[PDB]
Amino acid sequence: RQWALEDFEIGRPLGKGKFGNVYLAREKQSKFILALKVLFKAQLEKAGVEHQLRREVEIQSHLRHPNILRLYGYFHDATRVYLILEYAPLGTVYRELQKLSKFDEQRTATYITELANALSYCHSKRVIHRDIKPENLLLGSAGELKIADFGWSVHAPSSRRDTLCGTLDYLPPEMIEGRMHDEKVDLWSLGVLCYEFLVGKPPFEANTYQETYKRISRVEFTFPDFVTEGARDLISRLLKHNPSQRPMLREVLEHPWITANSSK
Numbered sequence: 001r002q003w004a005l006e007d008f009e010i011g012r013p014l015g016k017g018k019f020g021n022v023y024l025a026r027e028k029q030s031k032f033i034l035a036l037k038v039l040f041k042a043q044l045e046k047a048g049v050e051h052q053l054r055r056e057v058e059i060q061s062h063l064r065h066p067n068i069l070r071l072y073g074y075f076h077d078a079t080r081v082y083l084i085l086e087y088a089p090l091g092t093v094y095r096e097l098q099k100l101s102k103f104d105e106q107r108t109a110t111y112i113t114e115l116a117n118a119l120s121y122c123h124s125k126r127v128i129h130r131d132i133k134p135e136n137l138l139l140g141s142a143g144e145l146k147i148a149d150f151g152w153s154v155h156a157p158s159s160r161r162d163t164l165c166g167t168l169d170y171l172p173p174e175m176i177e178g179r180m181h182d183e184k185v186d187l188w189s190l191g192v193l194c195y196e197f198l199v200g201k202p203p204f205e206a207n208t209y210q211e212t213y214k215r216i217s218r219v220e221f222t223f224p225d226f227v228t229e230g231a232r233d234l235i236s237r238l239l240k241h242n243p244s245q246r247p248m249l250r251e252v253l254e255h256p257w258i259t260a261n262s263s264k
């Protein structure tokens, strides 16, 4: 119908962003838990984003996928916009990558299947350029993976070491280089995710922004010796200066190494 803040109990902040925080929450009657994104909107003015958000939340409102975090509804009071969100109990793949220090091919190829499916759904719905770096990826009920994306970056207090300057590691050469982008943007990311999954760090990591840029644009990246070659093939194919040379999501999902180690 139409919600307002008084319909919700508020728990801890799950993450705190620059435009506001995501809080643990539950609808008061059903006692059903969700996540409430809170956007200050005075900060939105400056950043220049209001009305273009107010169309999105509609474009996102229509999106139904198991691997995408569902936006239930949205409202506003005076000074805040509220996104009513699905709760992902297990948090960020980023905390996890910190925990285990790296993943294996079963975990990886499985997540990658999950992502590829979201992106492909998104594409069929004419939605491109999701932010799939690990901090925006969440973990649902059992193992499952969920693209959050959407609102502007929230973190969970931790670590605090690599923060932003986590920036362009996942950015494709065409995006960085001040050019437009087709749907192909997202397969570059896919390739960077996979690498980080197995390696524990992204392929272009460097102490200076310009050097990171160097390797990205020049597609300069190596592998540690433990990376299976089917991984190598997939990543190598995924990361190409030319968007054209990059796969459609099909052959990604069809990829030998994927099919092998993918639990889904």
Ligand SMILES: O=C(O)c1ccc(Nc2nccc(Nc3ccccc3Br)n2)cc1
Residues within 6 Å of the ligand: 014, 015, 016, 022, 035, 069, 085, 086, 087, 088, 089, 090, 091, 092, 135, 136, 137, 138, 148, 149, 154, 155, 156
């Ligand atoms: O820290 C934790 O234990 C923790 C973090 C997140 C969650 N669940 C959740 N659900 C829906 C949205 C959302 N936003 C979000 C919050 C922080 C970072 C990134 C995102 Br994107 N977070 C649960 C526990």
